[PDB]
Ligand binder design. Structure first.
Ligand SMILES: Cc1ccc(C(=O)NC2CC2)cc1-n1cnc2ccc(N3CCN(C)CC3)cc2c1=O
Length: 341
């Protein structure tokens, strides 16, 4: 057991191992406050997130469990993983706090504001990371610039995947980058919700503008159909909702724009890949693996260095347990954590 020390940082008491020094608030992450810190053991800069009231309710407790399990499983360069997890609790009965320690990247894509080459490298990394999480049947669901962490090398990791509700978790998504299908629940969804997000992000990297800055669900939908065209009979067949079909066919029928007119003077391959990401029909949207093999990524693509993940057990997601059952499960996961080399 390590030596802990306490420290007031903006409202709450942080209690952390002495190996972590110079704690420095950097605002909110998902479900808690994050400090940058210096790890004296490794000489690394790290992000430390203290979860906010992890066991206050079934939602908090389950989501504490989910986040921890997610982090422990991720071993991939373009996906955030777990350097350390600690609690100041000496036993289960006083277990009330969970701290999660990862690499500290130093910026995000939301700050960034980029030549065609940077876009290539950056989107390549997103897709490579996405291929890895999709293979373990984990989906991000709220991929967006603010959770794409990058360092001054343009190296990139994805954060905050697996947290947004499947079909509550208390996680707050950002409208502008969501696949229309999961925003309007208008048709079943799959892993390619994240590919739409990649589309919106890639578009913003090339033009400087948010592609679809809607003020609500309906405005947003209006902006999307202005680009991609109102769907024909083929896609309209696949939508159950009487009202979603109403909206689509009631807005004046929009023709599909030429993507070369919108993403002016972009690499034609960039344009082409956008055309394959930003299609309304989820069954026809390009996957992460297929997008990696696209010609736009020829300087970066390597079939033997685009790994998939080991099988991730998430049968727990379908379980309705008490807070204390989730808590014990979390505590087990904490006690059995082995650091990386
Ligand atoms: C610590 C941590 C734990 C877990 C996870 C995570 O992805 N979990 C899911 C299972 C995938 C992520 C992080 N993490 C890592 N580095 C960061 C670096 C900076 C920041 N800010 C910087 C900008 N400010 C305005 C706002 C916030 C937050 C973070 C941050 O939340």
């Amino acid at each position: 057991r390590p030596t802990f020390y306490r420290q007031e940082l903006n409202k709450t008491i942080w209690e952390v191992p002495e190996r972590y020094q110079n704690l420095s608030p950097v605002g909110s992450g998902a479900y808690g406050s994050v400090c940058a810190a210096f790890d004296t053991k490794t000489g690394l800069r790290v992000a430390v997130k203290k979860l906010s009231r992890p066991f206050q309710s079934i939602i908090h407790a389950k989501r504490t469990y989910r986040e921890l399990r997610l982090l422990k499983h991720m071993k991939h360069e373009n996906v955030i993983g777990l350097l350390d997890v600690f609690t100041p609790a000496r036993s289960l009965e006083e277990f009330n706090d969970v701290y999660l320690v990862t690499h500290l990247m130093g910026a995000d894509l939301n700050n960034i504001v980029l030549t065609d080459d940077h876009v290539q490298f950056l989107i390549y990394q997103i897709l490579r990371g996405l291929k890895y999480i999709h293979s373990a049947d984990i989906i991000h669901r709220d991929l967006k610039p603010s959770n794409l962490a990058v360092n001054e090398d343009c190296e990139l990791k994805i954060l905050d995947f697996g947290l947004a509700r499947h079909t509550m978790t208390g996680y707050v998504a950002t409208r502008w980058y969501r696949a229309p299908e999961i925003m309007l629940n208008w048709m079943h969804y799959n892993q390619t919700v994240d590919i739409w997000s990649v589309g919106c992000i890639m578009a913003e990297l090339l033009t400087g503008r948010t592609l679809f800055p809607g003020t609500d669900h309906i405005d947003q939908l209006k902006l999307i159909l202005r680009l991609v065209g109102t769907p024909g009979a083929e896609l309209l067949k696949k939508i159950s909702s009487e009202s979603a079909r109403n909206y689509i066919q009631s807005l004046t029928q929009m023709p599909k724009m030429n993507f070369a007119n919108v993403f002016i003077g972009a690499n034609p391959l960039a344009v082409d890949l956008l055309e394959k990401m930003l299609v309304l029909d989820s069954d026809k949207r390009i996957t992460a693996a297929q997008a990696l093999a696209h010609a736009y990524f020829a300087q970066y693509h390597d079939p033997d260095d685009e790994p998939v993940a080991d099988p991730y057990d998430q049968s727990f997601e379908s379980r309705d347990l008490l807070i204390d059952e989730w808590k014990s499960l979390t505590y087990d996961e904490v006690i059995s954590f082995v650091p990386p080399p």
